[PDB]
Short mmCIF file of C-alpha atoms in Angstrom, two decimals:
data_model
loop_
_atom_site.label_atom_id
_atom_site.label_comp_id
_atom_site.label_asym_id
_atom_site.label_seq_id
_atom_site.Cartn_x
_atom_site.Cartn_y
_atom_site.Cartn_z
CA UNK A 1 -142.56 56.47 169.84
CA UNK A 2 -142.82 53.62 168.58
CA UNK A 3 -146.07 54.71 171.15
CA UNK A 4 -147.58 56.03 167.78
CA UNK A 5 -147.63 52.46 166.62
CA UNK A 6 -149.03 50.79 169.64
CA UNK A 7 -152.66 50.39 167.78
CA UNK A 8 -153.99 50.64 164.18
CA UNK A 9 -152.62 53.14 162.33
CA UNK A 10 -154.42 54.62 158.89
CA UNK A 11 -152.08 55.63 155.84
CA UNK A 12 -152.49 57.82 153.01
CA UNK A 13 -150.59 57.28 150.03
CA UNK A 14 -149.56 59.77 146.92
CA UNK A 15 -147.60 59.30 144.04
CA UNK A 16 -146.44 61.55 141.31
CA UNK A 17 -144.59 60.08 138.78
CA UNK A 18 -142.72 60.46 135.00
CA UNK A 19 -141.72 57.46 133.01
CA UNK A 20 -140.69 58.53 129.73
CA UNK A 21 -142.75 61.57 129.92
CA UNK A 22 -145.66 59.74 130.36
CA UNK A 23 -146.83 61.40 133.84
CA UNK A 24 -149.11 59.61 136.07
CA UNK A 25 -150.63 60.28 139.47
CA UNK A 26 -151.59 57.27 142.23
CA UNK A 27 -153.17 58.25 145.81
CA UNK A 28 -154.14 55.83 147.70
CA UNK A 29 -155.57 54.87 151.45
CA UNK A 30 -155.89 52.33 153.94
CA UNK A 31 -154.06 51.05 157.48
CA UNK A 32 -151.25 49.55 159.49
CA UNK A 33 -150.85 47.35 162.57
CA UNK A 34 -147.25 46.98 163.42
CA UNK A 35 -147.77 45.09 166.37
CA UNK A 36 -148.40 42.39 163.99
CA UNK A 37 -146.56 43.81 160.82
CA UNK A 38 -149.37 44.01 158.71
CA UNK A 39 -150.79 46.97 156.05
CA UNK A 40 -153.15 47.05 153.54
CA UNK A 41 -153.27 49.45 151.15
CA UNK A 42 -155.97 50.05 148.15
CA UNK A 43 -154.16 52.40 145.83
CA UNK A 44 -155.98 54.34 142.64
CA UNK A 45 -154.63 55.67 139.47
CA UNK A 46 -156.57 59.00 139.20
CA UNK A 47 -154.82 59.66 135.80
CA UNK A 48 -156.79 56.83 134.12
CA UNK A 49 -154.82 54.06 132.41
CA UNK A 50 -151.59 53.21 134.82
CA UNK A 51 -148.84 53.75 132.40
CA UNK A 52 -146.51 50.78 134.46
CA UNK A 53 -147.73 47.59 135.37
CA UNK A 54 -148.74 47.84 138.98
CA UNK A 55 -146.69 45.21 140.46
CA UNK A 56 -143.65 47.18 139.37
CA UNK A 57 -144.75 50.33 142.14
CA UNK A 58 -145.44 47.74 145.08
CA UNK A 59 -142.33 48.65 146.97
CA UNK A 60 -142.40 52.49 146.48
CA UNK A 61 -145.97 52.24 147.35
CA UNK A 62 -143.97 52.41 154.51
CA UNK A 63 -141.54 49.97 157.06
CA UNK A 64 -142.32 51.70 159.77
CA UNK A 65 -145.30 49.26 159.68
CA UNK A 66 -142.89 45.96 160.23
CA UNK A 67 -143.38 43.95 163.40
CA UNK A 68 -139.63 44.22 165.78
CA UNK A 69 -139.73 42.15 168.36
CA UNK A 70 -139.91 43.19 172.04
CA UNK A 71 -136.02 42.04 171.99
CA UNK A 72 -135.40 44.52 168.84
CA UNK A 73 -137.13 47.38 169.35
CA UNK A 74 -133.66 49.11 169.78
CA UNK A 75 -133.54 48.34 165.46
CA UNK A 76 -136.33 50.06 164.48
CA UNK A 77 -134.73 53.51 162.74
CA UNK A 78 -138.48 53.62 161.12
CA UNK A 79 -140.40 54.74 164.11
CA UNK A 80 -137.87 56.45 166.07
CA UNK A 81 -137.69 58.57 163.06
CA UNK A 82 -140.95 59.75 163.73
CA UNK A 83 -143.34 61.64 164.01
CA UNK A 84 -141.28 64.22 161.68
CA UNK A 85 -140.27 61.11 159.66
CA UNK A 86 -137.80 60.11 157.27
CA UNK A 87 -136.93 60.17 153.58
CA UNK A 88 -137.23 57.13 151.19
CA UNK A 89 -134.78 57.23 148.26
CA UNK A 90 -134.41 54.48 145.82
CA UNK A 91 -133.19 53.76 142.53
CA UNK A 92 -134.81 50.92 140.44
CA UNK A 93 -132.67 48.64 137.98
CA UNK A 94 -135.06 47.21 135.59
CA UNK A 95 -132.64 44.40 133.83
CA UNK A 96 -132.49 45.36 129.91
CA UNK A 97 -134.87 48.44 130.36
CA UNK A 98 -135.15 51.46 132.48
CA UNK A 99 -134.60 52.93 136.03
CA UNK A 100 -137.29 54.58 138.65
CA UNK A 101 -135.36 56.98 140.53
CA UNK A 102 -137.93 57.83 143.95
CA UNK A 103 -137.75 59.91 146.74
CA UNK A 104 -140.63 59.67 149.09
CA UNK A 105 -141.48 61.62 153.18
CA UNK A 106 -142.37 59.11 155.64
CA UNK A 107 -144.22 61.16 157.95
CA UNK A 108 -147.16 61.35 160.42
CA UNK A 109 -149.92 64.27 159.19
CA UNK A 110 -152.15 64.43 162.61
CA UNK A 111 -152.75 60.86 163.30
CA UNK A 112 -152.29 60.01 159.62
CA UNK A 113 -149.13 58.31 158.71
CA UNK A 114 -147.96 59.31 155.18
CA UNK A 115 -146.07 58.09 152.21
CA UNK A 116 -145.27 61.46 149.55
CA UNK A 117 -143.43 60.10 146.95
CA UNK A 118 -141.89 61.57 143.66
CA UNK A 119 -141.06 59.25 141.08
CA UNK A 120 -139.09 59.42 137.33
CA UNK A 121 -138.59 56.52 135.11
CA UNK A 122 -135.84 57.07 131.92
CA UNK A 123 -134.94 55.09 129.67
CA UNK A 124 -137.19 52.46 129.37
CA UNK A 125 -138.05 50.38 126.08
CA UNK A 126 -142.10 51.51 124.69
CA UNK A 127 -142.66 47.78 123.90
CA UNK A 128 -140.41 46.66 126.97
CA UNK A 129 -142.17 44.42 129.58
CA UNK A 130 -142.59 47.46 132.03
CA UNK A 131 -144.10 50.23 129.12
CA UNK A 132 -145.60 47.07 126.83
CA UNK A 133 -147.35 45.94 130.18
CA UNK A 134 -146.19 42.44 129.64
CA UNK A 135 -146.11 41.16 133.82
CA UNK A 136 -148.08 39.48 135.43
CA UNK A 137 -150.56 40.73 138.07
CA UNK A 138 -149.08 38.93 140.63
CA UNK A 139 -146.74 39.08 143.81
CA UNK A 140 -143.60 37.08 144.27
CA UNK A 141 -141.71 34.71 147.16
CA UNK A 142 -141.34 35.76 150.06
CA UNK A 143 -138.32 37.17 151.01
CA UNK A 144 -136.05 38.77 152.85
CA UNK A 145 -134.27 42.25 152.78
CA UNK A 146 -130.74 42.94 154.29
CA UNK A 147 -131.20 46.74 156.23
CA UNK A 148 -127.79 48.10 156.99
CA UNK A 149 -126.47 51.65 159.16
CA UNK A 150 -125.94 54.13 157.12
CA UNK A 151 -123.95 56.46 159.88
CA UNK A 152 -122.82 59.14 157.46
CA UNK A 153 -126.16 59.80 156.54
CA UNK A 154 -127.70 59.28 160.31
CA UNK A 155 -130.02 56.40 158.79
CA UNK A 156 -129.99 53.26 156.97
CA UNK A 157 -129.68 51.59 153.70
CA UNK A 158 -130.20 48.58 151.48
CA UNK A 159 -130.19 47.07 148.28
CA UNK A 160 -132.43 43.62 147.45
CA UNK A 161 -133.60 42.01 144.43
CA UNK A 162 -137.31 41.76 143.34
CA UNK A 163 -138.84 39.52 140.36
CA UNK A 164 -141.43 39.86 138.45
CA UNK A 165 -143.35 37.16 136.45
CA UNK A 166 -143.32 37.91 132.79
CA UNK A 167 -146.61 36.76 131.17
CA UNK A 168 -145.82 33.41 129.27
CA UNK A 169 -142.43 33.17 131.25
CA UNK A 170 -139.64 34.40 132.58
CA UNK A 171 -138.65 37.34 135.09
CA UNK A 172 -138.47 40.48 135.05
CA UNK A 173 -135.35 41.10 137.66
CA UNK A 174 -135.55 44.93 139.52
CA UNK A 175 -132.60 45.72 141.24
CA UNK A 176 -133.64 48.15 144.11
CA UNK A 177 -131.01 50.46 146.03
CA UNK A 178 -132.40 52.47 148.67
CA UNK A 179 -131.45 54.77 151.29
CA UNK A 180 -133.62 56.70 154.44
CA UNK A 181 -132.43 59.65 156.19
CA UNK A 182 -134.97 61.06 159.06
CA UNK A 183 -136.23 64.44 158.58
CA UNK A 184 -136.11 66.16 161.44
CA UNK A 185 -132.96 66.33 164.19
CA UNK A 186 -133.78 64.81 167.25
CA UNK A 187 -132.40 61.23 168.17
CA UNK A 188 -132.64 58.42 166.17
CA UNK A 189 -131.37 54.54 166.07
CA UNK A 190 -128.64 53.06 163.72
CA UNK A 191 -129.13 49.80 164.16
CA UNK A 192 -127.49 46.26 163.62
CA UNK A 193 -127.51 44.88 160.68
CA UNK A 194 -130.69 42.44 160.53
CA UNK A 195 -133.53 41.32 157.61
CA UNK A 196 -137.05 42.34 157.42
CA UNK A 197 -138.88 38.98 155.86
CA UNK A 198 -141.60 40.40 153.54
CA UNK A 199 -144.53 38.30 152.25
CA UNK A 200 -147.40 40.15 150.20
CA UNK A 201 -150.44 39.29 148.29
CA UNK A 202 -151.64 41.64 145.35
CA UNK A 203 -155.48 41.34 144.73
CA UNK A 204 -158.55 43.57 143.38
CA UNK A 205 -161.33 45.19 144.19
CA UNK A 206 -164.26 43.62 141.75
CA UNK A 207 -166.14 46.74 143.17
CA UNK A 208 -163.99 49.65 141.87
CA UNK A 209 -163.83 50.65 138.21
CA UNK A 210 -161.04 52.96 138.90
CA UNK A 211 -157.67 51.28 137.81
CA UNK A 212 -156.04 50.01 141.02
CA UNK A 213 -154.05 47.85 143.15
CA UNK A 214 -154.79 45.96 146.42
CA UNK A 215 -152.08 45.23 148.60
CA UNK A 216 -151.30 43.59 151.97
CA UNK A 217 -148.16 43.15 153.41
CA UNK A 218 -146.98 41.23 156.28
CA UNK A 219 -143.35 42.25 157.41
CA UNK A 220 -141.06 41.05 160.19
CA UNK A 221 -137.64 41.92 161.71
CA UNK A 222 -135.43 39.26 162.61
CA UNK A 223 -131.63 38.87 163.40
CA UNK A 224 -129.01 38.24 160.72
CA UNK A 225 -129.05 34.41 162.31
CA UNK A 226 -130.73 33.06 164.88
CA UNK A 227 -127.73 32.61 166.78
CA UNK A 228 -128.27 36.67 166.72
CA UNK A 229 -131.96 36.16 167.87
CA UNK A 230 -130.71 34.15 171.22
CA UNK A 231 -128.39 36.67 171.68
CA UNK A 232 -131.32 39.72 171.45
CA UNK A 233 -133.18 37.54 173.97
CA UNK A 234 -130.63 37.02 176.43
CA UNK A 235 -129.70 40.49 176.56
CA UNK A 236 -133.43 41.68 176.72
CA UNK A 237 -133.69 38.96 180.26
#
């Protein structure tokens, strides 16, 4: 399963992460409902001060959460990965600044899915927008990422593009290039190549005085086209 996914699902989240030697730890908590392709995550820095902007750790802060249709459930790598999981790699382009390099487990503890995640950050610039804290606390468009077989690696891959608003104007373009493998060796999907359409909303807590980020996602599969869609359907009866 897939069958693990059925209902609401809580998540625990931890980060540990380097960015120019400036080390910083983020845990964070909250659930999933893939039925509906919805999470919501509240996420803490327990170090203090966030050395990053938060906006800039959204996506390496769980797909295994996006809604597949009845008609694609044969897609989904993310939960036939599990219960023993998978690994999320990524590298981060920053444009004119540094790179995050993370590698996270995807994984259920008990009932608990998890997301343990490593993360180091070189080369950045101290009074860059990403170390000078100079985005916006926002979210962007939504959007849509391209997920591609990876059958060397028995898993998938993808690269996409986010932007972030730069205070007073302008983007901040991070060029993301990530790859999942499953952990253990039982069977596993390599699917088509289709999008997941991702919108998300970044908000706070006015009750915690912690340093933190509040995020809900809302994530769908869909075929390359919708010509590919019909074609799901008619095969599905």
């Amino acid at each position: 399963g897939e069958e693990l996914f059925t209902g609401v699902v809580p998540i625990l989240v931890e980060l540990d992460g380097d960015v120019n030697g400036h080390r910083f730890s983020v845990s964070g908590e909250g659930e999933g409902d893939a039925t509906y392709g919805k999470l919501t995550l509240k996420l803490i820095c327990t170090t203090g001060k966030l050395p990053v902007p938060w906006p800039t750790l959204v996506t390496t802060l769980v797909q295994c959460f996006a809604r597949y249709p009845d008609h694609m459930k044969q897609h989904d790598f993310f939960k036939s990965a599990m219960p023993e999981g998978y690994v999320q790699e990524r590298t981060i382009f920053f444009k004119d600044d540094g790179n995050y390099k993370t590698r996270a487990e995807v994984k259920f503890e008990g009932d608990t899915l998890v997301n343990r995640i490593e993360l180091k950050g070189i080369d950045f610039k101290e009074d860059g927008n990403i170390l000078g804290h100079k985005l916006e606390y926002n979210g962007w468009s939504a959007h849509n990422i391209y997920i591609t077989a990876d059958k060397q690696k028995n898993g998938i891959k993808a690269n996409f593009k986010i932007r972030h608003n730069i205070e007073d104007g302008g983007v901040q373009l991070a060029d993301h290039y990530q790859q999942n493998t499953p952990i253990g060796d039982g069977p596993v999907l390599l699917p088509d190549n289709h999008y997941l359409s991702y919108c998300s909303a970044l908000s706070k807590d006015p009750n915690e005085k912690r340093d933190h980020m509040v995020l809900l996602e809302f994530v769908t599969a869909a075929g390359i086209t919708l010509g590919m869609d019909e074609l799901y359907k008619l095969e599905h009866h």
